[PDB]
Ligand binder design. Structure first.
Ligand SMILES: Nc1nc2c(ncn2[C@@H]2O[C@H](COP(=O)(O)CP(=O)(O)OP(=O)(O)O)[C@@H](O)[C@H]2O)c(=O)[nH]1
Ligand SMILES: [Mn+2]
Ligand SMILES: [Mn+2]
Ligand code: NA
Ligand code: NA
Length: 320
DNA sequence: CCGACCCGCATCAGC
DNA sequence: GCTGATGCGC
DNA sequence: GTCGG
């Protein structure tokens, strides 16, 4: 329930705009409309009712109308049956395959995972890993496994250097009972926004997590951001846990609070807070907040919320 | 009538 | 080789 | 696609 038909249609339309039309602002417009419609405490019986809502215009009104009177949207019906368009859309579910790679693959007749499999030579490293773990990466992670994951990360990080500080953020820090991946924020006293008194600070941590076979694969790795794969250890004759996505971001120790707000999310929440900062006359990123002027000061997450006239919403409530 | 719409890394284009 | 641009995911 | 200068 919950304007579910309209919200589902709009998200499907959003996905088509992103993956097939390569029209990112349309995708976002559909997502915004869907999220405002999902917040509406009433059942929409007309396109104009919907139109009174912020982010809903004439075209979405037109769609709600057809959908209400027919239970269907001809455009989506046609799109769903379209071999080329459905395949391009499907292939973007592989991590590392975006709209462009998906269209190039479908162009050459590569439309399915099996096509991908027998065409390894045509995949970059990221894409080969997205394909190897396609099922796993769409699996959800129970909070119980999350905590076993946090134990390992925190254990191994302090084993490299007791001065490190690791914080699991993302849906985890927001109390989610399941997560899509693990987001880890890392700080060390050597790395500060003013000087980098030690090198390899992120590398040593990844290496350690690799040595104890927690991290199994690398999708991207630079001085400040790791994107990869990890896996909880198993017991004797026990079904192996799924492989899971893990991201690690090394933030300067003096911008930890901007980091936590950033990596805690959500993504729709973030761009709803970022889109609010600009109208209060502020800029928000994972490092600072600025009027852009010098770095406005911070030592708490509520400090950011007051700046833009926002009442503190707890991590659990940032699930927008 | 039309422009705006919230950064790190891998790979590509090109000099 | 190198810079700069683009794709991708965040 | 939607909003607003
Ligand atoms: N300013 C932005 N921040 C983002 C964006 N996407 C993610 N994030 C921030 O990083 C945090 C982690 O992003 P993820 O892609 O892993 C999604 P999240 O952790 O919120 O939930 P899961 O599905 O359980 O992984 C997210 O909460 C926030 C974005 O597009 N823009
Ligand atoms: Mn996450
Ligand atoms: Mn993540
Ligand atoms: Na409206
Ligand atoms: Na993808």
């Amino acid at each position: 329930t919950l304007n579910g038909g309209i919200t589902d249609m709009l998200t499907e339309l959003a996905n088509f705009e992103k993956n097939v039309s390569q029209a990112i602002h349309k995708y976002n417009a559909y997502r915004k409309a869907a999220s405002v419609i999902a917040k509406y405490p009433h059942k929409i019986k007309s396109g104009a009712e919907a139109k009174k809502l912020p982010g809903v215009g004439t075209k979405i009104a037109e769609k709600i109308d057809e959908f209400l009177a027919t239970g269907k949207l001809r455009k989506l019906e046609k799109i769903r049956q379209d071999d080329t368009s459905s395949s391009i859309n499907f292939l973007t579910r592989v991590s590392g395959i975006g709209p462009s790679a998906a269209r190039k693959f479908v162009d050459e007749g590569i439309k399915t995972l099996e096509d991908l499999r027998k065409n390894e030579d045509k995949l970059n490293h990221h894409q080969r890993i997205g394909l190897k773990y396609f099922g796993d990466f769409e699996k959800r992670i129970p909070r119980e496994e999350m905590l076993q994951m946090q134990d390992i990360v925190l254990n191994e990080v302090k084993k490299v250097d007791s001065e490190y500080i690791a914080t699991v953020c993302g849906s985890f820090r927001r109390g989610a009972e399941s997560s899509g991946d693990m987001d880890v924020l890392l700080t060390h006293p050597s790395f500060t926004s003013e000087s980098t008194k030690q090198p390899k600070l992120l590398h040593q941590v990844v290496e350690q997590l690799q040595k104890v076979h927690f991290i199994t694969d690398t999708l991207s790795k630079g001085e400040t951001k790791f994107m990869g794969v990890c896996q909880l250890p198993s017991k004797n004759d026990e079904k192996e846990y799924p492989h899971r996505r893990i991201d690690i971001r090394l933030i300067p120790k003096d911008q930890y609070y901007c980091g936590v707000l950033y990596f805690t999310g959500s993504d729709i929440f973030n761009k709803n807070m970022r889109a609010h900062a600009l109208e209060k006359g502020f800029t928000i990123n994972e490092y600072t907040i600025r009027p852009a002027g010098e770095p406005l000061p911070v030592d708490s997450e509520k400090d950011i919320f007051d700046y833009i006239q926002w009442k503190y919403r707890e991590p659990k409530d940032r699930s927008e």
